[PDB]
Structure 1
Amino acid sequence: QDSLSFGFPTFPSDQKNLIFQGDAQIKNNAVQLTKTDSNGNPVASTVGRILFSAQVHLWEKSSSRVANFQSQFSFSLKSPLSNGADGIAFFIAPPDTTIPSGSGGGLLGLFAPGTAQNTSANQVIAVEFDTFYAQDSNTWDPNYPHIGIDVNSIRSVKTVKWDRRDGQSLNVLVTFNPSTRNLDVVATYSDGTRYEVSYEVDVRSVLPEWVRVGFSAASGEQYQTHTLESWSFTSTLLYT
């Protein structure tokens, strides 16, 4: 299809169009990307991802068209600790994507350790919300929590300082304009605190014509719950 839209105001346990990978599962009408114990507390060493089953037509070579897209979603992070890890990310990747071996912790379940920073070895665009930046393990991160745009690498091509607020929902709007090639990210807390970061990228030279969209989250030795609360997505092929 030239256009596709779907909306999850909430996440009932009765799902048919979601691909669950790793420890991701539905709980309390929300998607718990990372594993939690009996009483609902986050645990260490866990990775989880979900992908919408239907493939998205990002660009069409024959017609020379590129899709414009918009992903709106909200999530919250909670942890008994203070410095919870590792973060949640919205990503777009080839349809057959799976969790890479050893992609836990700071790799957010998106990259393989050996190729995490090799751009020519990956096919992924992700918008990460990174809460852990210890320079001993996450050498690629600036030293402060942040939102980043990742293009084939765990080392963001662009970042903005971000504030982690335990148990507070973050509203996010991600949009890609094929006419200007800008991928814009707008994130805001209920009180109006706003964060913005954008980057110009030609998706055609990064991803195949058909892709899949979803979320990924992980917790290494440090942990926190990565709760996806709602999600709407729409894509339309356009001639620029």
Structure 2
Amino acid sequence: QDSLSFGFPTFPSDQKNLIFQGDAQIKNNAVQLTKTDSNGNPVASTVGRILFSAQVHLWEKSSSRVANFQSQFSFSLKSPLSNGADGIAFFIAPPDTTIPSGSGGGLLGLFAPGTAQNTSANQVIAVEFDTFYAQTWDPNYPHIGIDVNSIRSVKTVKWDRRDGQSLNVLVTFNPSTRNLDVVATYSDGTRYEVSYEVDVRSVLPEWVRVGFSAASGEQYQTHTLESWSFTSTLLYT
């Protein structure tokens, strides 16, 4: 299809179009990407991801078209301790993507340790929310980063972690300008913006899958996806 869109105002436990990987699962109408105990508390050494089953047509060589898309979502992080790790990320990757071996902790379940910074060995675009808890490639402060085939963000902006508070995020890609814009805000109006120019055609295959990934190494916290809407349409360029 040239156009595709779907919306999850909440996440009921009766799911049919979500691909669950690692420890990801539904609890209390939300997606718990990282493992939680019976008390609903976060645990260490856990990784989880989800993908929408339908494949998205990102670009079409044949017609020289590239999709215009936007993903809107909300998440919250919680922990008994004052801070947590490691972070959550929205990502776009090849349809058959699976959790790489040894991609826990700071790798957010997105990259393999041996090729984490090798742009030629990866095909992925991600918007990460790093809670910088525990000191090496990205800035030494919590931030929102845009990753293009590397765990080392090509662009970042300072960010603030607030326990238990939902962050509303809007990610958009405009094929005529090639700008991938990210806007995140807390209910009180605190806003965070970061954008980057990138030609998705040279980074990802024509058909891709979209979803989220999160991980906790030694330090932990829950990475709870609360809502998610996505729309995409191929446009002539």
Scaled by the length of structure 1, the TM-score of the pair is 0.98
Report which stretch shifted further, 181-190 or 81-90.
Answer: 81-90
Deviations 1:41-72 (A, max 9, x none): 00000000000000000000000000000000
Contact 1:133/1:141 (8 A) holds in 2: no
Give me the identity figure in percent.
100
CA contact (8 A) 1:145 1:162 kept: yes
Point out where structure 1 has 5 or more consecutive residues left out of the alignment.
none
By how many angstroms is 1:81 displaced?
A: 1.5
Distance 2:209 2:167 in 1: 23
Q: Are 2:72 and 1:75 aligned?
A: no
Count residues in correspondence. Answer: 237
CA deviations on 1:73-125 (whole Å, 9 max, x unpaired) are: 00000011122000000000000000000000000000000000100000000
Q: Alpha-carbon deviation of 1:133?
A: 5.1
SS of residue in 2 equivalent to 1:102:
coil
Residues 23-51 of structure 1: CA distance to partner in whole angstroms, max 9, x if unpaired?
00000000000000010000000000000
Task: Please list every run of at least 4 consecutive aligned residues from structure 1 whose deviation after the TM superposition is greater than 3 angstroms.
Answer: none
Output one character per residue of 1:177-199: Cα deviation in whole Å (capped at 9) or x when no partner: 00000000000000000000000
| Cα-to-partner distance string for 1:178-222 (whole Å, 9 max, x where unaligned) | 000000000000000000000000000000000000000000000
For the Cα contact (< 8 Å) 2:83–2:133, is it kept in 1? no
- Which whole-Å CA distance do the structure 1 matches of 2:67 and 2:146 have between them? 19
Could you tell me how far 1:141 is from its partner in structure 2? 1.8
CA distance in 2, matches of 1:40, 1:134: 23
The answer to whether the 8 Å contact 1:17/1:53 transfers is: yes
Aligned positions of 1:150-169 closer than 5 A: 150-169=147-166
**TM-score (normalizing by structure 2):** 0.99
- On the 8 A contact 1:130/1:145 being kept in 2, the answer is yes
Structure 2, unaligned stretches of length 5 or more?
none
SS of the residue corresponding to residue 113 of structure 1 reads coil
